[PDB]
Amino acid sequence: SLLNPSNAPTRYAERSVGPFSLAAIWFAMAIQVAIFIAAGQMTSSFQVWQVIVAIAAGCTIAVILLFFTQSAAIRWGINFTVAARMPFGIRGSLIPITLKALLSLFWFGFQTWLGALALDEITRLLTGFTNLPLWIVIFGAIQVVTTFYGITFIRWMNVFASPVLLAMGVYMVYLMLDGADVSLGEVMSMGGENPGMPFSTAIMIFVGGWIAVVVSIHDIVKECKVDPNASREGQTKADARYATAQWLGMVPASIIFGFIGAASMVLVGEWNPVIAITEVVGGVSIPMAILFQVFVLLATWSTNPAANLLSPAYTLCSTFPRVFTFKTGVIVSAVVGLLMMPWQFAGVLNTFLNLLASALGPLAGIMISDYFLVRRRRISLHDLYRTKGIYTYWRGVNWVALAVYAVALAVSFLTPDLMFVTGLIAALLLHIPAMRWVAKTFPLFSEAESRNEDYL
Ligand SMILES: O=C1NC(=O)[C@H](Cc2ccccc2)N1
Ligand code: NA
């Protein structure tokens, strides 16, 4: 048996996140430093308005993906890590999941670093003392302790941060434009003096940014509010209402701040607004500096925990259920996380994000396909928490599913600038015959699936 109270499905009565709250999480979750860098470097290949469009487009494909990847977690309250057990093995799932938990972990140490940088700047602008590693640990630690309160903290922290973050950001645009004596429309076309990159791969970069979060949203949305007595059409509007809520959360947020990163680049040559606003205005008071850094901290806290730490946590406590608990998995994830020292990763993010998309495209494709197409939303919670059942396949691993991943990954390379969308579509479609083959040896359904409601 693989069940324990932390890795258990989330009961209808235990659910706490409705459609408005999820938007309020995504809005503050999109406001984070790394989009300054991405949208900034984009000004090299396109002008600002197109970048904004590449952002809105990439945001929209992500949501279209969310509509599908979130449906099982909302309805059934389950983990990502647990949900992967279906197409891949009960253990075989650990392979892509280790890929993904690593990715997730990489991002956690990166933003903790940016967060640490901020707190260290606030202090050295008050005391000249400038030790970063201590402030690294202390922040990593602070996130852990606030992450202990799981989605309860996350949800309260993001609703109050959201408008403040929204205001600090709208303010930021005024200060630049004013102090540079430039209208909004003028800045909207100042970029793109070094073309070469296709516009499709641009969209693919902002998609590749949130690919990890979207593919494992489960860990957030298994907490969302559901009415068990809906219907096909009421379940679908529910899915759509949530997907819509995620759209209105991540788009307007990441457009305003994407624009700020781009504007910084194009006005002053740096994606970082600290520099861009400092120059344009010719220095700023110690208060108004400390402020900016309070922003960065506020912008990191609303994203890092929820997006980067939740999912490896649940991976530990659900694979080693008697060894780890949620709270302990959080401690182990944040330690490993920082010990990956990701702040030394050579290159730029864009290409990394281009890496991330074509690396998880088939994963999202195989999960959407197994649940929606092969099984028709008809799943067995019972077997997901047991070493030997209809999801065990060949001694815990479904090699055919690991094969479809490879094959789809290959075909993906045949279309480098659209890798992700070909790899998803390839994995999606191939899972169908592959699964109609495995179904001749192993069963796709189980009697125990009638105990589903016992869990809820
Ligand atoms: O999946 C993740 N986790 C992260 O921290 C980053 C956040 C991000 C950076 C740049 C563009 C979109 C999302 N992406
Ligand atoms: Na944030």
Curated annotation (Swiss-Prot):
Species in which this protein is naturally found: Microbacterium maritypicum
Positions that bind Na(+): 28, 31, 299, 302-303
Location(s) in or outside the cell: Membrane
Transmembrane annotation, as ranges: 20-40, 48-68, 94-114, 134-154, 157-177, 197-217, 248-268, 289-311, 329-349, 352-372, 395-414, 418-435
Residues annotated as binding substrate: 111, 209, 308
pH dependence statement: Optimum pH is 6.6.
Keywords (A to Z) from UniProt: Membrane, Metal-binding, Sodium, Transmembrane, Transmembrane helix, Transport
GO MF annotation list: metal ion binding; nucleobase transmembrane transporter activity
Keyword Lyase set for record: no
Disulfide bonding pattern of the chain: none
Regulation of protein activity: Inhibited by dinitrophenol, 5-(2-naphthylmethyl)-D-hydantoin (D-NMH), 5-(2-naphthylmethyl)-L-hydantoin (L-NMH), 5-bromovinylhydantoin (BVH) and 5-indolylmethyl-L-hydantoin (L-IMH). The affinity of benzyl-hydantoin is increased over 10-fold in the presence of 15 mM of sodium.
Main function: Nucleobase-proton symporter that mediates the sodium-dependent binding and uptake of 5-aryl-substituted hydantoin compounds. 5-indolyl methyl hydantoin and 5-benzyl hydantoin are the preferred substrates, with selectivity for a hydrophobic substituent in position 5 of hydantoin and for the L isomer over the D isomer.
Membrane topology: Multi-pass membrane protein
Any one cellular-component term (Gene Ontology): plasma membrane
Protein name as it appears in the record: Hydantoin permease
Pfam family, one: Transp_cyt_pur
Residues forming coiled coils: none
Superkingdom of origin organism: Bacteria
Family according to the record: Belongs to the purine-cytosine permease (2.A.39) family.
